[PDB]
Each structure stands twice: as structure tokens, then as C-alpha cells.
Design a protein around this ligand. Structure first.
Ligand SMILES: O=C1CC[C@@H](C(=O)O)N1
Ligand SMILES: [Cl-]
Length: 304
């Protein structure tokens, strides 16, 4: 029996729900192609690290992969749509925002030699610290782990000192004092056992950024018709299942952080007001960088 074999690099822990859904996707592709396409995922950055996956897929070093594409918004600012703070703070609203951004993002991805087969939101983003934080007076000079330009910008507005670290390297960065604070979901704090190093999480749910499963555009264009439709069928089903799993686990992760000794609370009123002011500035900066396209996306979203 003849079959194509593809390696699919992914950046997050093997037991993170995104990675598990990569395997679900591969199983569906194998079934729906009658065995003709067998995908093996490589989670945890074990084949290509997170910072390498986009280029690997663009050049065909890997045919398919998963990447958190807002970590490439410096090259393509439209990819920052999913880090606009306080714009879409629920799963339902994030789906509407993706619906408003999809055509423009698909066009931008094509210009980068990529096709996104499915995407999936992480849970809402909040702040991890090693101490109580009630205002930006408490955050001045704290070393911070960013995961993209938007989180680095947010950190700088709070007077923190950001450096980018991929999730697979986050535990060691915390253990060695590279950072004492970061923005992420409850999911990544759990997967990286961050209670070993930090004490507080503030549940802001400021945005729901997405992973994307991307395929090399030349490979996609050259696939047999049946293989291509099977990939899309598998992708649609996986994207639905992954987003359901993400939402089902969101609050469970918080309970796990608490069970391991962390203080998990909403941001205080003074702190939240600062975060919302910074978020408005970041949304204005994004709109200036993307221009009319950004105005169109936000308007289309608000009409839904
Ligand atoms: O919730 C999230 C967003 C990206 C990823 C991270 O911290 O790297 N976890
Ligand atoms: Cl569970």
C-alpha cells in the first residue's frame, strides 16, 4: 500500500489540547484519505522549535505545521488581529472576529506562501506574577516573558522588561530568573507547572489568540483533489473539536492552578482600568499599522 508520509511540527506540550488535536487531525486525514496520507505530529518543538515552524512550512522543509501566527505580526501586522485587547473576550466573540478577519488573513497568508487549514483559540489571556499586583506601580522593572510583539508591547507599557521565550522553554526561563511575569492562558501555566516559580494569576481574558495549522501553498496547490478535500474535511472537524475542548478546559486550568497553591483572581479595578487604557492604545496602533483593512475588520465584527 502506497502512502505519503508528512511530519507536522507543533510547539506546545504533547498533552496540551492543541497538540492532542493535531493527532486527531492526523487520524481524520488518514481515515478520509483511505490511508494515502499519514501525518505524524512532533509537538513540544521537538522537530522544529516554535520560532522555526513558519519558515519550515514556507520553504517546504516541513509540508504542514502549527504556528501561533501572531508571533509573526512584525512581518505581517494583519496577523495581530487576535491580540487586540478587550475587543473579543469570549469564544463566541472571537469566532465573530475571525469571521471578520478571515478573508484578509487568508490573502496575507497566501502572500507568505501559506494556507491555513484550521485555526483554534487559546483561552483568555491574563497575567502571571511572583507577587501581588494592584497597579503599574507594582510592575515597574519586572522581567517579563513575552510570546509575541503584542505581549512585549503590553509589558513595556506596564514598565516591565520583556524578552520572548517559546512555551517549550518557559519552565527553564522561570527557573533561571529570565522572567518573573508573563501573559498567557491558564492552559500554559498548567502545562508548564508555573506554580513552581510564580504565585499569582490575574484572570483578565483580554483576548483569545489563535494557533493556525498551515500548509505550504505550493504543496497545497499540487495535491490531488481528493487528498486536498480530505485535509479540509479533517481540518473543519478538528477546528470545531479543538475550540470546544479549549473552552471546556479554560476554567478547569484555573482550578488546577489554585490546587497547586496559586492565587487566581480577577484584576483589581485600578489595575483593570490601566490594562483597558493600554489596550485601547494598542488597538489604535494596530489600526494605524494596517490602515483601512483594519477599520473594515473591526467594523464587520461590530455588526455581527
Ligand atoms: O495561551 C497561550 C497563548 C500562547 C501560549 C503561550 O503562552 O506561549 N499560551
Ligand atoms: Cl480533564
Amino acid at each position: 500500500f502506497q502512502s505519503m508520509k508528512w511530519d507536522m511540527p507543533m510547539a506546545y506540550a504533547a498533552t496540551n489540547f492543541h497538540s492532542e488535536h493535531g493527532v486527531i487531525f492526523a487520524d481524520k486525514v488518514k481515515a478520509y484519505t483511505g490511508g494515502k496520507l499519514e501525518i505524524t505530529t512532533h509537538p513540544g518543538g521537538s522537530l522544529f522549535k516554535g520560532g522555526e515552524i513558519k519558515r519550515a512550512v514556507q520553504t517546504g522543509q516541513a509540508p504542514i505545521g502549527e504556528r501561533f501566527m501572531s508571533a509573526h505580526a512584525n512581518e505581517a501586522p494583519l496577523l495581530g488581529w487576535d491580540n487586540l485587547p478587550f475587543l473579543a473576550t469570549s469564544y463566541e466573540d472571537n469566532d465573530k472576529l475571525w469571521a471578520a478577519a478571515k478573508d484578509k488573513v487568508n490573502a496575507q497568508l497566501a502572500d507568505l506562501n501559506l494556507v491555513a487549514l484550521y485555526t483554534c483559540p487559546w483561552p483568555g489571556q491574563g497575567f502571571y506574577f511572583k507577587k501581588e499586583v494592584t497597579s503599574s506601580a507594582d510592575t515597574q522593572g519586572i522581567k517579563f516573558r513575552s510570546y509575541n510583539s503584542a505581549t512585549a508591547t503590553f509589558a513595556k507599557e506596564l514598565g516591565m522588561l520583556p524578552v520572548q521565550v517559546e512555551a517549550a522553554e518557559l519552565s527553564q526561563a522561570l527557573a533561571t530568573g529570565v522572567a518573573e511575569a508573563f501573559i498567557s492562558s491558564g492552559s500554559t501555566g498548567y502545562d508548564r507547572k508555573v506554580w513552581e516559580h510564580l504565585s499569582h494569576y490575574y484572570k483578565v481574558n483580554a483576548w483569545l489568540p489563535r494557533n493556525y495549522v498551515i500548509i505550504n501553498k505550493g504543496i497545497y496547490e499540487g495535491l490531488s483533489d481528493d487528498i486536498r478535500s480530505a485535509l479540509h474535511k479533517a481540518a473543519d472537524e478538528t477546528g470545531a473539536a479543538c475550540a470546544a475542548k479549549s473552552a471546556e478546559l479554560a476554567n478547569w486550568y484555573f482550578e488546577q492552578l489554585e490546587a497547586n497553591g496559586m492565587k487566581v483572581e480577577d484584576a483589581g479595578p485600578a489595575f483593570l482600568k490601566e490594562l483597558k487604557s493600554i489596550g485601547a492604545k494598542m488597538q489604535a496602533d494596530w489600526l494605524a499599522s494596517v490602515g483601512a483593512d483594519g477599520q473594515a475588520i473591526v467594523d464587520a465584527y461590530k455588526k455581527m
